[model samples]
Target: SKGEELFTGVVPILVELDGDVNGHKFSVRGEGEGDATNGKLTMKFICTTGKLPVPWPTLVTTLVLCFARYPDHMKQHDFFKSAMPEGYVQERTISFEDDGYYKTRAEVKFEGDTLVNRIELKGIDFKEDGNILGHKLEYNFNSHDAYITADKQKNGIRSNFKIRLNVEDGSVQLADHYQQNTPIGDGPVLLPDNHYLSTQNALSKDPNEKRDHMVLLEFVTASGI
Candidate 1:
């Protein structure tokens, strides 16, 4: 035969692409800008809300770039690696200005893998009484790309933060959030303080009109991740 049949009464072999599609799908997260070409992709991974930088939105770009920089970060395991399905080869990199957010370009060369793969993701955008929170708060790989393998430590350390909000009664509510800290060994840092505010829109400026809105509260893991 010219080539070995995939499934037949003949010699059989298997291979794996050690990466996380379920746990951490490789795609753009947050409310930034991006695009795809041929088999390559480019994204504006960073956008600001008001005068302060958007933390969660920024984290989305940071993590994706980190994995690209260290392809080894995609390893599943010994056995799993040998069993993973074959796919395209992906390469990516990101750059940022002093504003502190990243926009990246990624390319996938289809040697024998599928010709096209849609990028998938889940995003959480917060708002207060109808404001965009000026940013998207969280994200994860959707079901279509659910297979995964990643470093637990890196995920935790890279996204940890302690937060609190100032309430109208002069009381305080403590909260926690994910704050990405890549390139590990960085010194101690501080997150932005949470400040609560009410809203009034041209359509509904009445004091008791009960307007629609959203909050930019940071989401955190119960454990220290």
Candidate 2:
């Protein structure tokens, strides 16, 4: 039972930021939160609109750097902060509330600004599928793409999902995400459009092909040209 207990104490995180003297020009600003609980995490980011292609993890790092002040030193809480960056006014705060699981949410939007900006979540079956693979999982938004896999501890089960928001062409619509029930061998799972990207994991086929329901070995693999 020791290996089957949920994890706690790793308090949640929140961040906010503002640029220097050019606060009216290129000031990156927004507020988002992160929660790592019992094998799951959810991140939310919100900011201005100016046709920006932000690789979230970079922003997450930028938003959390200035909390190192002597007074608070982020020592007051798990993690939270932002201050003057050369000239701008960056600010962020943290709190632990209703933080649980992973799923797609908004990050960087109509938060009117000078030039600043912003930064998910998953789903699936477990009780019926139990933890087939004994694995420990963890993921960070260090890049444009992020992955999440959950395997319950007590009444264990396994589910894996990844969302790659190819931000390049998704500039037209940067405020939304969609769920896609992938199919096996049924190539061409047409996405909504060119500016908004969302792909499904083979592990979450939803019986789209019926045959796919039993074939759960589409484990992920990196694709190269």
Candidate 3:
């Protein structure tokens, strides 16, 4: 008999991918039906409100490229060697560049069992101007997990931040958030330093029209693989 008849009715597998672009988080999920025989697949992607770097088709292609190269690049770090999946071959290095004031380059490579990946940003200057700059990031993989840290000081203040990714489970944690400057559980600033905007007997002030911007995103997934 052919190889197809050897296995049947195998359980489906589920797969998920998650990441962020310019502080906007996105997620993709899929199902892999059956094992070895009669297999099927399904997938879906959702993202939060934010301007995309490129058109949808282009963005999708870029996302897939990065995801596919993850394992190969992850193996570069010594910590990730033992945890990498088995039976994969890499023939070449992959790299991409984005169009922005500060050009960003994403590169991945797998040399034998070792993998290394990096995203480099160039041509950005903030010291001359008073503009508040964002943080640069660097990533390292290990023990089937990934660690990210601030790459450089964009502004005078150090962007104290960290990110941890559990590759096996597709879970991520923001170890440190740069925005949390104040002590934890601090109350809101209810009063101003001067009487012009003081909160003392606040009811005396007149009400004025105010505006705020809010964006929301919702995602759902169905998968077996």
> Which one wins on TM-score?
3
lDDT of 3 by residue, 1-225 (tens): 121122233433333334343443444333323232212222222333333222222121112111111122222211111112221111111122221222323333232422223233232332222111222212222121112221222211111223232222354322321211111122221111111100000011113412111111111111111
- Error in Å for residue 152 of model 2: 39
Q: Where does candidate 3 stray beyond 4 Å?
A: 1-10, 32-40, 46-94, 97-225
lDDT at 129, model 2? 19
Over 57-91, each residue of candidate 2 has an lDDT whose tens digit, in order, gives 21232332111111222222111111111112222
| Model 1 misplacement above 4 A | 1-118, 128-132, 135-225
lDDT of each: 0.22, 0.22, 0.23
Question: Which candidate's lDDT is highest?
Answer: 3
lDDT of 1 at 193: 21
Model 1 lDDT per residue over 154-212, tens place: 42113233323333345433333333322122322122122111111111112452322
TM-score of each: 0.19, 0.21, 0.22
- Cα deviation at 41, candidate 3, in Å, is 2.6
lDDT measured at residue 64 in model 3 versus the true structure, 0 to 100: 10
